[PDB]
Amino acid sequence: PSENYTWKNVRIDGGGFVPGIIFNQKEADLIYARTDIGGAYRWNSATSSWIPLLDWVGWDNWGWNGVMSLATDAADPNRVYAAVGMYTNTWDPNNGAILRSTDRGNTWQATPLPFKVGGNMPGRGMGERLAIDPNRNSIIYYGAEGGNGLWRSTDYGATWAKVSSFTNGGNYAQDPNDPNDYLNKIQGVVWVTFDPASGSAGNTSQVIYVGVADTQNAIYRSTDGGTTWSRLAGQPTGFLPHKGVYDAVNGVLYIAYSDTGGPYDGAKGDVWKFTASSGTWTNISPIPSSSSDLYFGYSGLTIDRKNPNTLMVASQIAWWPDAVFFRSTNGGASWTRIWDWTSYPSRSFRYTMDITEVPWLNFGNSNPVAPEVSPKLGWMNESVEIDPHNSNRLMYGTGATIYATENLTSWDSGGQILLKPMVKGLEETAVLDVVSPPVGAPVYSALGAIGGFRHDDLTKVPTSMYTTPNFSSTTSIDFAELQPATMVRVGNLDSGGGIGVTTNAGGSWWQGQNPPGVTSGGNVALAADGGAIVWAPGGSTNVYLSTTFGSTWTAISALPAGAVIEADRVNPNKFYALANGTFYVSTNKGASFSATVTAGIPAAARKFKAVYGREGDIWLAGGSSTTTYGLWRSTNSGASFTKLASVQEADNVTFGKAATGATYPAIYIIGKVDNVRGVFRSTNEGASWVRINDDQRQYGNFGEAISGDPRIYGRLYLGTNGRGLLYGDSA
Ligand SMILES: [Br-]
Ligand SMILES: [K+]
């Protein structure tokens, strides 16, 4: 029963991988970005921010936040298309689709494809797989994964079918024997590139190039408008084509190759130029694979459409010392580089970088060891793109951000370019945990990949993620309810796990010691008075107690490894745990636990929380469609639970400031109520619910982490997996 809400991202700016940036070839300032887990965006030049286009993807079709390819129509810039779906293994139960729009992504219609799309799979930086004929814009191609080959629509994307005459679907998988079933999928037909001079407006383009992840048959061509196809004669072998860029001014195809599909690796490759009139091949690599010291392949290939003798390419991948970008102003006959060695470990630079708007991009390290700098130029830089309307502007994606320059041709006159982040509005993090204390800052985030932050102001990017320790991913965070400046957090670092503690609300932290066997953060609880920590680390065989604020540990005998731990928010002697349908309680401040409930709680449930101000009041959410599912509450410190009749399904629960005149905190759930999936609030102890999101604001596989706000009625901090941390307020 909806209430009008306003939803916004807590401001972080970026934080994830941007495998593709796409400029429209006819309309200036029209730019899109595709992400691997976080949907797609359109740039708004009036507000200098990105606009998310796929927030209407919901609980059952969540994989469609994986955006494997996107095409914006040069001939009709209101038209845009996306290939969506997240995994090609069992982690995404649904097939992929092609989405079509006639209003720049404000709305879409879907056409399901009879196979999966791998928006968050290996190979996702190769592209674009989707391409629109620039002369007859009713014709769209899609290079598919899996060996499904080349697919096509002749009706503006509404219907799709296999191109029967294209008979090489690709034969490369990163690791065909991967027991984890992630690196083992056929990456397929990886890009489609038209020659626009091969037709005229209204008539089918006759010349089409296609890249295939097949070391021995990387490049195909049609000269009859896609009726027949054949491998390009004389092409090089041994490598996979990440990008194929065609210039009709000089009549040349440029291809960037690497020895893997990316995006995290690549040890060798080449850049080649095919001249279409003569059929000649020329190796234009800045550093060719015949050179003994090459230690990367190539991607990030882009041509300057305003001045098409100029092109750039980039390392796929140089982790050390940093990425390298190359620029040629003579069609690849010679290059210069964005940095050079002077005397190792020192370098000279053709760029400067200003992260004032996104200061956490130095990863908390303002004392890098040469030859590294901080922030770095980038990594996972598969998409590097010159603005086809402005030779001075370039944008590129990394595994954390988008950087941009507006003075690129400064390079050509011997100067430095300026690079800055360009991610306002693009919010791509996965939220693992979140807390809102009753004093101090409104919220603390625990994030994948970039650690997380104290957010002093929801409208301002935080200065730094947590340091000392700096986790790559913070998996769990807690504060002592009766002493909220005392906090703990656990997470991942340096291939294992660790714990951080603070007594000044994160003004400074320090790192505790580890119990045996820690391989990842797992989850943590802090007693209500700060006097005890219970940590269930990843990898460890047990759950551990500290009475020394993380300095030392002792094993808890009764708990299963990896149990979910929660403190009572009132009584410092009480802790709780949940694992696989058994609920456990401690009344001796975490030293020992006993099983209290072994029936009626779904085995799959793994979220529960004690209520601030209410000793022994606990709400529990979880289950599955094939077992039982819903929301349970205990008012007796976990001795028994009762299922709420008013909820069909629930996946998480939290509490926030009570409604005026109400006798209990407001309750927020991720769930299904009266046959509607969404986000729900109850201000009467669960007796009824009101939906606080809406069908355009669903955010896919959200809700791993949520928190209400004890100081602000109506507010929910809503974590997502790829759309950052949202806050909703009653309007
Ligand atoms: Br490297
Ligand atoms: K490498």
XYZ file of C-alpha atoms and ligand atoms in Angstrom:
733
model
C 0.000 0.000 0.000
C 2.405 2.693 -1.276
C 3.632 5.821 0.541
C 5.375 8.517 -1.494
C 9.109 8.251 -0.916
C 12.173 9.930 -2.249
C 15.151 7.663 -3.012
C 18.745 8.866 -3.463
C 22.240 7.336 -3.440
C 24.417 8.065 -0.471
C 27.215 9.759 -2.391
C 30.296 7.681 -3.116
C 30.880 8.159 -6.915
C 31.768 5.039 -8.922
C 33.431 2.202 -7.093
C 33.082 -0.620 -9.618
C 34.125 -1.732 -13.072
C 32.906 0.153 -16.162
C 33.640 -2.251 -19.050
C 32.115 0.010 -21.751
C 31.641 3.683 -22.506
C 29.712 4.474 -25.656
C 29.450 7.829 -27.376
C 26.760 8.471 -29.958
C 28.444 9.128 -33.320
C 26.034 11.924 -34.410
C 24.821 13.769 -31.325
C 27.323 15.558 -29.117
C 27.248 14.963 -25.369
C 25.170 11.807 -25.753
C 27.112 9.132 -23.826
C 26.207 5.843 -22.151
C 28.066 3.545 -19.780
C 27.496 -0.133 -19.213
C 28.327 -1.979 -16.075
C 28.828 -5.611 -15.137
C 26.561 -5.760 -12.060
C 24.948 -2.364 -11.911
C 22.895 -1.702 -14.971
C 23.482 1.075 -17.494
C 23.644 4.868 -17.458
C 23.128 7.875 -19.669
C 25.153 11.057 -19.100
C 23.210 14.268 -18.281
C 25.272 17.233 -19.491
C 22.949 19.728 -17.771
C 23.525 18.266 -14.314
C 27.001 16.818 -14.946
C 25.803 13.461 -13.665
C 24.955 10.012 -14.851
C 21.358 8.761 -14.908
C 20.653 5.031 -14.114
C 18.423 3.363 -16.675
C 17.758 -0.144 -15.305
C 16.527 0.455 -11.737
C 13.162 -1.072 -12.735
C 14.953 -4.522 -12.934
C 13.616 -6.405 -9.941
C 13.816 -9.459 -7.728
C 13.049 -12.203 -10.208
C 14.865 -10.748 -13.273
C 17.877 -9.412 -11.363
C 20.404 -10.710 -13.846
C 19.369 -7.976 -16.220
C 21.547 -5.530 -14.313
C 24.408 -7.236 -16.115
C 24.972 -5.210 -19.272
C 27.084 -7.132 -21.755
C 26.717 -4.624 -24.603
C 25.021 -1.403 -25.467
C 24.474 0.406 -28.832
C 23.202 4.000 -29.304
C 21.788 4.709 -32.801
C 23.797 7.279 -34.810
C 20.984 7.560 -37.319
C 18.338 8.113 -34.613
C 19.814 9.174 -31.283
C 16.607 8.529 -29.338
C 17.161 4.781 -29.976
C 19.292 2.607 -27.660
C 19.703 -1.118 -27.145
C 21.269 -3.300 -24.430
C 22.177 -6.946 -24.169
C 21.509 -7.943 -20.593
C 21.980 -10.923 -18.275
C 24.640 -11.505 -15.652
C 26.007 -15.048 -15.657
C 26.318 -17.879 -18.160
C 26.751 -20.449 -15.362
C 24.164 -21.493 -12.734
C 24.431 -18.313 -10.719
C 21.942 -16.571 -13.053
C 18.935 -18.821 -13.483
C 17.566 -16.750 -16.342
C 18.456 -16.319 -19.982
C 19.577 -13.027 -21.353
C 17.621 -10.516 -23.404
C 17.902 -7.624 -25.747
C 16.297 -4.463 -24.380
C 15.142 -1.803 -26.881
C 14.248 1.810 -26.243
C 13.060 4.807 -28.257
C 13.578 7.327 -25.371
C 17.259 6.992 -24.527
C 16.663 4.371 -21.914
C 13.920 6.005 -19.937
C 11.758 2.997 -20.902
C 12.475 -0.332 -22.539
C 10.880 -3.408 -23.990
C 12.500 -6.819 -23.641
C 13.023 -9.633 -26.136
C 14.311 -12.739 -24.372
C 17.128 -14.643 -26.042
C 17.280 -18.442 -25.974
C 20.654 -18.462 -24.161
C 22.451 -16.711 -21.333
C 24.247 -13.402 -21.367
C 27.368 -12.939 -19.242
C 27.413 -9.367 -18.037
C 29.607 -10.347 -15.055
C 31.586 -13.161 -16.808
C 35.063 -13.382 -18.146
C 35.393 -11.636 -21.467
C 32.917 -8.803 -20.578
C 35.336 -6.069 -21.631
C 35.425 -7.200 -25.206
C 32.915 -5.474 -27.429
C 30.680 -3.972 -28.466
C 28.817 -7.191 -29.334
C 25.727 -5.190 -30.370
C 25.929 -3.032 -33.451
C 23.320 -1.103 -35.481
C 23.659 -0.614 -39.210
C 24.485 3.079 -39.673
C 22.729 3.193 -43.069
C 19.651 1.008 -42.445
C 19.053 1.363 -38.723
C 16.315 -1.300 -38.549
C 19.191 -3.877 -38.748
C 20.956 -4.805 -35.480
C 23.558 -7.541 -34.857
C 24.514 -9.268 -31.646
C 27.652 -11.383 -31.160
C 26.576 -14.061 -28.650
C 28.420 -16.127 -26.075
C 28.467 -19.919 -25.768
C 29.047 -20.803 -29.436
C 25.500 -19.580 -30.266
C 27.128 -17.463 -33.015
C 25.908 -14.280 -34.596
C 22.346 -13.100 -34.131
C 20.362 -10.433 -35.915
C 17.216 -8.356 -35.878
C 15.719 -6.617 -38.927
C 12.914 -4.923 -36.943
C 14.643 -2.469 -34.636
C 15.415 -5.138 -32.049
C 11.907 -6.507 -31.536
C 12.642 -9.964 -32.893
C 15.947 -11.839 -33.067
C 17.212 -14.919 -34.854
C 20.432 -16.765 -35.537
C 22.380 -15.842 -38.673
C 22.505 -19.329 -40.254
C 25.364 -18.351 -42.588
C 27.733 -17.356 -39.793
C 29.226 -20.685 -38.707
C 31.974 -20.025 -36.191
C 30.664 -19.398 -32.673
C 34.103 -19.278 -31.091
C 36.052 -21.970 -29.199
C 37.907 -20.133 -26.433
C 37.098 -20.396 -22.711
C 39.557 -18.934 -20.198
C 39.894 -22.270 -18.354
C 37.698 -25.111 -19.840
C 38.324 -27.301 -16.830
C 37.573 -24.795 -14.075
C 35.994 -26.735 -11.247
C 34.324 -23.638 -9.972
C 32.326 -23.372 -13.248
C 33.132 -19.664 -13.731
C 36.130 -19.451 -16.074
C 34.928 -22.262 -18.345
C 32.314 -20.652 -20.641
C 32.813 -20.034 -24.353
C 33.226 -16.292 -24.806
C 31.914 -16.457 -28.388
C 31.443 -13.675 -31.000
C 32.868 -10.639 -29.396
C 32.192 -7.512 -31.611
C 30.528 -6.395 -34.796
C 31.796 -3.384 -36.738
C 30.240 -1.791 -39.809
C 31.881 -0.051 -42.731
C 29.569 2.933 -43.057
C 30.749 3.762 -46.585
C 29.384 0.406 -47.789
C 25.763 1.701 -47.953
C 23.876 4.971 -47.967
C 21.048 6.234 -45.856
C 18.100 3.915 -46.155
C 20.007 0.992 -47.698
C 21.711 -2.012 -46.097
C 25.430 -1.694 -45.350
C 27.237 -4.318 -47.416
C 30.541 -4.623 -45.509
C 30.525 -5.916 -41.955
C 33.453 -7.105 -39.810
C 33.042 -9.496 -36.886
C 35.451 -10.490 -34.122
C 35.438 -14.027 -32.753
C 37.227 -15.390 -29.697
C 39.041 -18.044 -31.711
C 42.879 -17.771 -31.968
C 42.895 -19.194 -35.469
C 39.871 -17.363 -36.888
C 39.651 -14.043 -35.074
C 38.191 -11.904 -37.849
C 35.318 -12.470 -40.261
C 33.834 -10.288 -42.962
C 30.707 -10.051 -45.085
C 30.755 -8.051 -48.317
C 27.122 -8.835 -49.250
C 25.209 -7.324 -46.387
C 25.389 -10.292 -44.123
C 24.150 -12.919 -46.553
C 27.518 -14.766 -46.498
C 30.600 -14.589 -44.300
C 34.171 -15.694 -44.494
C 37.391 -15.394 -42.552
C 39.574 -12.511 -43.486
C 42.529 -13.708 -45.550
C 46.060 -13.180 -44.250
C 45.011 -12.299 -40.759
C 47.272 -12.947 -37.799
C 46.750 -15.920 -35.523
C 47.365 -16.726 -31.906
C 45.312 -14.096 -30.113
C 41.830 -12.869 -29.326
C 40.395 -9.600 -30.688
C 39.195 -7.319 -27.878
C 38.252 -4.416 -30.214
C 37.763 -3.786 -33.925
C 37.497 -0.138 -34.961
C 36.900 0.845 -38.606
C 37.810 4.128 -40.221
C 36.096 4.808 -43.496
C 38.211 7.923 -44.139
C 41.385 5.895 -44.668
C 39.608 2.583 -45.274
C 41.300 0.672 -42.501
C 40.267 -1.679 -39.717
C 42.286 -1.501 -36.451
C 42.212 -4.511 -34.146
C 43.583 -4.841 -30.571
C 44.433 -8.374 -29.504
C 45.315 -10.101 -26.259
C 46.093 -13.732 -25.222
C 43.073 -13.896 -22.854
C 39.540 -12.596 -22.855
C 40.063 -10.199 -19.973
C 39.267 -8.230 -17.991
C 41.696 -9.137 -15.178
C 44.524 -10.645 -17.238
C 46.332 -10.513 -20.532
C 50.099 -11.167 -20.927
C 50.731 -10.735 -24.616
C 49.150 -9.335 -27.758
C 49.396 -7.065 -30.800
C 47.661 -4.225 -32.556
C 47.070 -4.724 -36.297
C 45.836 -2.532 -39.206
C 43.945 -4.059 -42.154
C 43.706 -1.905 -45.256
C 40.483 -2.904 -46.983
C 41.273 -1.770 -50.576
C 44.449 -3.873 -50.834
C 43.836 -6.550 -48.172
C 47.175 -5.785 -46.563
C 47.964 -6.470 -42.930
C 50.368 -4.410 -40.932
C 51.495 -4.921 -37.323
C 51.243 -1.446 -35.725
C 51.819 -2.589 -32.109
C 53.501 0.020 -29.885
C 55.313 -3.090 -28.619
C 54.670 -6.254 -30.657
C 54.439 -9.767 -29.220
C 57.676 -10.595 -31.096
C 59.429 -8.323 -28.553
C 60.730 -10.501 -25.706
C 59.773 -8.135 -22.992
C 56.072 -7.480 -23.803
C 54.064 -8.309 -20.746
C 50.519 -7.294 -21.685
C 48.012 -7.561 -24.490
C 46.019 -4.712 -25.969
C 42.592 -3.144 -25.555
C 41.223 0.295 -25.100
C 41.448 0.956 -28.861
C 39.834 4.159 -30.064
C 40.040 6.402 -33.132
C 39.574 10.209 -33.066
C 36.703 10.652 -35.467
C 37.384 14.342 -35.963
C 41.036 13.572 -36.868
C 41.099 9.897 -37.833
C 44.851 9.637 -38.331
C 44.863 9.782 -34.518
C 44.268 6.680 -32.440
C 44.964 5.357 -29.026
C 45.373 1.904 -27.439
C 46.097 0.651 -23.931
C 47.577 -2.212 -21.934
C 45.320 -5.210 -21.227
C 46.721 -5.686 -18.614
C 49.542 -3.942 -16.837
C 49.031 -4.067 -13.134
C 52.602 -2.886 -12.619
C 53.708 -0.225 -12.402
C 50.394 1.065 -13.801
C 48.416 1.026 -16.990
C 50.122 2.322 -20.156
C 48.252 4.327 -22.804
C 49.693 4.857 -26.302
C 48.841 7.554 -28.849
C 49.561 7.789 -32.535
C 48.834 10.737 -34.823
C 49.954 8.898 -37.971
C 47.714 5.886 -38.287
C 49.861 3.675 -36.109
C 53.193 4.209 -37.834
C 54.653 5.581 -34.574
C 53.477 6.049 -30.998
C 54.213 7.901 -27.849
C 53.248 6.807 -24.353
C 51.482 8.471 -21.422
C 54.488 7.810 -19.120
C 58.051 6.778 -19.557
C 60.866 5.547 -17.333
C 63.515 8.122 -16.541
C 65.793 6.278 -14.144
C 64.013 3.368 -12.613
C 61.995 3.526 -10.379
C 61.251 7.140 -11.493
C 59.006 8.059 -14.393
C 58.013 11.077 -16.435
C 54.308 11.708 -17.159
C 52.192 13.178 -19.956
C 49.332 13.526 -17.488
C 48.285 14.887 -14.137
C 45.365 13.584 -12.115
C 43.047 15.438 -9.799
C 40.783 13.346 -7.538
C 39.508 16.236 -5.354
C 35.915 15.181 -6.230
C 36.553 11.461 -5.365
C 39.303 11.601 -2.801
C 39.139 7.926 -1.736
C 40.644 6.976 -5.101
C 44.103 7.080 -3.504
C 42.903 4.022 -1.548
C 44.055 5.770 1.650
C 47.713 5.626 0.483
C 49.369 9.004 0.137
C 52.919 7.436 0.476
C 53.180 5.108 -2.470
C 56.465 3.188 -3.028
C 58.020 4.084 -6.372
C 57.440 3.096 -9.096
C 53.751 3.228 -8.033
C 51.880 6.484 -7.710
C 48.590 7.025 -5.871
C 46.056 7.402 -7.317
C 47.025 5.185 -10.210
C 46.252 5.844 -13.841
C 44.086 2.691 -13.855
C 43.682 -0.973 -14.451
C 41.054 -3.108 -16.321
C 41.059 -0.329 -18.874
C 39.270 -2.195 -21.630
C 37.158 0.811 -22.698
C 39.151 3.922 -23.631
C 37.210 6.265 -25.872
C 37.865 9.579 -27.652
C 34.762 11.782 -28.006
C 33.818 11.595 -31.705
C 32.674 15.262 -31.438
C 35.717 16.622 -29.608
C 39.296 15.431 -30.048
C 40.144 16.995 -26.660
C 37.814 14.754 -24.665
C 38.502 11.151 -23.735
C 36.944 8.881 -21.101
C 38.048 5.484 -19.899
C 36.757 2.867 -17.461
C 38.754 1.164 -14.759
C 37.849 -1.377 -12.144
C 36.922 1.454 -9.861
C 35.906 4.589 -11.748
C 35.649 6.510 -15.008
C 38.418 9.020 -15.623
C 38.123 11.821 -18.201
C 40.198 14.507 -19.849
C 38.992 17.643 -21.645
C 42.455 18.693 -22.899
C 43.720 15.553 -24.587
C 45.493 17.341 -27.466
C 47.858 18.920 -24.898
C 49.675 15.554 -25.369
C 50.446 16.475 -28.995
C 52.149 19.745 -28.214
C 54.444 18.183 -25.539
C 52.242 19.148 -22.602
C 50.389 17.212 -19.947
C 46.718 16.252 -20.079
C 44.570 16.613 -16.950
C 42.528 13.507 -15.837
C 39.670 13.680 -13.352
C 36.910 11.249 -12.269
C 33.643 11.528 -14.053
C 31.276 9.374 -12.037
C 28.781 11.650 -10.243
C 25.536 9.676 -10.224
C 27.136 6.363 -11.266
C 26.869 4.324 -8.058
C 28.162 0.817 -8.558
C 29.238 -0.673 -5.226
C 27.978 -3.779 -3.519
C 26.851 -3.171 0.048
C 27.735 -5.912 2.457
C 26.699 -4.368 5.786
C 25.464 -0.991 7.011
C 24.852 0.597 10.427
C 23.214 3.794 11.600
C 24.252 4.771 15.143
C 22.061 6.966 17.367
C 24.768 9.660 17.648
C 27.506 10.943 15.309
C 27.456 10.274 11.608
C 24.162 9.089 10.045
C 25.580 5.934 8.464
C 28.567 3.672 8.046
C 28.904 1.459 4.998
C 30.641 -1.849 4.549
C 31.366 -2.348 0.911
C 32.915 -4.753 -1.485
C 36.118 -3.755 -3.332
C 36.616 -0.314 -1.793
C 36.163 -1.053 1.962
C 33.421 1.353 2.954
C 33.122 4.604 4.821
C 31.832 6.711 7.584
C 29.420 9.015 5.819
C 29.438 12.376 7.640
C 27.220 13.939 4.950
C 25.115 11.779 2.575
C 25.617 14.414 -0.168
C 29.482 14.466 0.061
C 31.923 11.797 -1.097
C 33.908 10.514 1.909
C 37.591 11.431 2.091
C 38.865 7.878 2.604
C 37.700 4.392 3.115
C 38.576 2.788 6.426
C 42.304 2.332 7.089
C 44.508 0.614 9.663
C 43.259 -1.848 8.631
C 42.210 -1.142 5.073
C 40.049 -4.036 3.890
C 39.374 -4.591 0.190
C 35.855 -5.658 1.250
C 34.382 -4.999 4.698
C 32.035 -7.929 5.319
C 30.498 -6.918 8.702
C 30.464 -3.892 10.998
C 28.889 -3.259 14.458
C 28.771 -0.589 17.141
C 28.295 -0.979 20.888
C 24.643 0.138 21.263
C 25.245 1.769 24.683
C 28.596 3.241 23.634
C 28.421 3.929 19.889
C 31.845 5.452 19.441
C 33.143 1.889 20.137
C 32.954 -0.068 16.838
C 34.360 -3.159 15.176
C 34.566 -4.313 11.567
C 35.816 -7.435 9.815
C 36.777 -8.083 6.272
C 39.202 -9.174 3.615
C 42.745 -8.190 3.001
C 46.030 -9.403 1.595
C 44.361 -12.660 0.516
C 42.988 -13.434 4.066
C 40.883 -11.648 6.683
C 41.175 -9.366 9.652
C 39.519 -7.152 12.223
C 39.526 -3.430 12.897
C 38.482 -1.686 16.102
C 37.921 1.911 17.197
C 36.927 3.790 20.382
C 36.349 7.188 18.641
C 33.736 6.292 16.047
C 36.405 5.683 13.380
C 38.492 8.865 13.908
C 41.151 6.219 13.989
C 41.121 2.452 13.927
C 43.629 -0.210 14.692
C 44.006 -3.772 13.620
C 43.446 -6.659 16.046
C 45.010 -10.089 15.877
C 43.476 -13.148 14.244
C 42.315 -16.459 15.511
C 43.451 -19.492 13.527
C 42.310 -20.283 10.021
C 40.917 -16.970 8.894
C 40.566 -16.765 5.113
C 37.958 -13.926 4.842
C 36.090 -11.543 7.086
C 32.962 -13.412 7.878
C 30.781 -11.586 10.426
C 31.148 -9.929 13.821
C 29.121 -8.727 16.811
C 29.955 -6.306 19.589
C 28.371 -6.418 23.018
C 26.052 -3.584 23.930
C 28.632 -2.074 26.341
C 31.629 -2.684 24.058
C 33.111 -5.271 26.427
C 33.166 -8.339 24.255
C 33.470 -9.240 20.550
C 32.195 -12.427 18.959
C 33.756 -13.030 15.502
C 32.747 -15.792 13.078
C 35.549 -15.559 10.515
C 35.530 -17.063 7.041
C 37.641 -20.248 6.786
C 38.029 -20.743 10.573
C 36.736 -23.928 12.166
C 35.118 -22.053 15.049
C 33.574 -18.806 16.198
C 35.771 -16.870 18.689
C 35.335 -14.575 21.643
C 37.564 -11.594 22.492
C 37.457 -9.830 25.878
C 40.546 -7.768 24.952
C 38.997 -5.735 22.134
C 40.511 -7.873 19.461
C 44.004 -8.387 20.814
C 43.358 -12.029 21.724
C 40.797 -14.726 21.113
C 39.279 -17.964 22.552
C 37.265 -20.585 20.666
C 33.506 -20.984 21.362
C 32.809 -24.646 21.546
C 29.123 -24.983 20.467
C 28.783 -22.772 17.420
C 29.162 -23.964 13.879
C 31.742 -22.195 11.783
C 30.316 -19.276 9.938
C 27.271 -18.789 12.125
C 25.565 -15.458 11.853
C 26.208 -13.568 15.140
C 24.230 -10.700 16.646
C 24.460 -8.909 19.980
C 21.485 -8.012 22.133
C 21.233 -4.204 22.016
C 20.385 -3.773 25.691
C 21.958 -6.530 27.760
C 25.704 -6.809 27.221
C 25.684 -10.419 28.477
C 23.466 -11.651 25.678
C 24.548 -12.723 22.176
C 22.706 -14.729 19.562
C 23.594 -16.923 16.590
C 21.846 -18.520 13.649
C 22.988 -21.333 11.388
C 21.084 -23.697 9.078
C 17.788 -23.677 11.020
C 19.187 -23.608 14.577
C 19.134 -20.605 16.827
C 21.657 -20.284 19.610
C 21.885 -18.001 22.645
C 24.618 -16.890 24.997
C 23.840 -15.354 28.430
C 27.462 -15.184 29.586
C 28.732 -12.440 27.267
C 29.744 -14.781 24.459
C 31.811 -17.364 26.267
C 29.405 -20.234 25.500
C 26.197 -20.674 23.474
C 23.387 -23.292 23.567
C 20.890 -24.260 20.920
C 17.399 -22.960 21.746
C 15.362 -23.566 18.568
C 15.934 -26.349 16.032
C 12.540 -26.360 14.262
C 10.234 -23.983 12.363
C 13.042 -21.602 11.290
C 13.934 -22.129 7.609
C 17.352 -23.702 7.028
C 18.141 -21.059 4.406
C 17.481 -18.071 6.804
C 20.580 -16.058 7.559
C 19.397 -12.610 8.585
C 18.152 -11.526 11.995
C 18.507 -8.589 14.285
C 17.922 -7.579 17.909
C 15.966 -4.435 18.495
C 17.593 -1.298 20.014
C 15.893 -0.459 23.373
C 14.165 -3.891 23.623
C 16.085 -6.627 25.421
C 15.489 -9.972 23.974
C 13.357 -8.855 21.072
C 14.663 -10.359 17.827
C 13.260 -10.435 14.277
C 14.375 -13.058 11.765
C 13.864 -13.153 7.922
C 14.493 -15.833 5.370
C 13.617 -19.034 3.660
C 12.909 -20.188 0.130
C 10.067 -20.868 -2.269
C 10.536 -24.681 -1.875
C 10.699 -24.795 1.952
C 9.097 -22.109 4.130
C 9.591 -18.354 3.953
C 8.709 -15.322 5.955
C 9.335 -13.127 8.934
C 9.601 -14.442 12.540
C 9.885 -12.634 15.883
C 11.036 -13.619 19.362
C 10.224 -11.656 22.426
C 11.907 -14.085 24.867
C 15.676 -13.721 23.988
C 15.430 -16.433 21.373
C 13.807 -19.194 23.407
C 11.050 -19.441 20.754
C 9.831 -17.591 17.648
C 6.469 -16.907 16.079
C 5.867 -16.356 12.329
C 4.091 -13.199 11.269
C 0.959 -13.859 9.346
C 1.150 -10.519 7.526
C 4.299 -11.442 5.478
C 4.577 -14.024 2.707
C 8.415 -13.813 2.235
C 11.148 -11.848 3.883
C 14.896 -11.629 3.196
C 16.061 -9.039 5.695
C 14.783 -6.857 8.545
C 15.799 -3.706 10.380
C 14.394 -1.011 12.726
C 14.162 2.711 12.713
C 12.639 5.657 14.558
C 9.004 5.084 15.619
C 6.081 6.921 14.081
C 4.773 9.766 16.229
C 2.612 8.292 18.933
C 3.555 4.703 18.147
C 4.882 2.399 20.872
C 7.512 0.456 18.855
C 10.324 1.276 16.382
C 9.351 1.209 12.712
C 10.211 -2.077 11.052
C 11.640 -2.323 7.449
C 11.812 -5.512 5.420
C 12.903 -6.735 2.034
C 10.091 -9.089 1.112
C 6.799 -10.072 -0.388
C 3.568 -8.799 1.201
C 0.091 -9.441 -0.280
C 1.588 -10.750 -3.540
C 3.865 -7.724 -4.075
C 7.701 -7.821 -4.003
C 9.537 -4.817 -2.688
C 10.548 -2.868 0.369
C 8.025 -2.536 3.214
C 7.573 -0.561 6.382
C 5.450 -1.395 9.429
C 4.779 1.185 12.137
C 2.471 -1.146 14.234
C 4.725 -4.029 15.121
C 4.111 -6.032 12.020
C 0.323 -5.898 12.002
C 0.337 -4.227 8.582
C 2.805 -2.916 6.010
C 3.155 -0.101 3.464
C 5.332 -0.434 0.305
C 8.002 2.244 0.272
C 9.638 1.572 -3.089
C 7.960 1.362 -6.521
C 8.212 -0.551 -9.811
C 10.861 1.851 -11.224
C 12.979 1.573 -8.029
C 13.555 -2.125 -7.462
C 17.366 -2.432 -7.773
C 17.563 -6.105 -8.572
C 19.303 -8.401 -6.040
C 19.228 -5.788 -3.327
C 18.826 -5.990 0.427
C 21.878 -7.929 1.662
C 22.422 -4.977 3.971
C 19.803 -2.624 5.308
C 19.430 -0.285 8.288
C 16.745 1.999 9.607
C 17.744 5.306 11.182
C 17.059 5.637 14.953
C 17.115 9.421 14.660
C 15.060 9.917 11.510
C 11.504 8.634 11.115
C 10.730 6.976 7.773
C 14.374 6.656 6.637
C 15.854 3.433 5.334
C 19.437 2.833 4.296
C 18.964 0.280 1.498
C 21.992 -1.625 0.299
C 22.225 -2.971 -3.167
C 24.600 -5.325 -5.040
C 25.831 -3.013 -7.759
C 23.810 0.156 -7.233
C 25.500 1.399 -4.088
C 23.863 2.440 -0.857
C 20.466 4.168 -1.179
C 18.574 6.228 1.379
C 14.800 6.520 1.201
C 12.877 9.238 2.982
C 9.087 9.597 3.475
C 7.793 12.500 1.204
Br 51.395 -6.925 -14.875
K 50.064 -8.671 -17.632
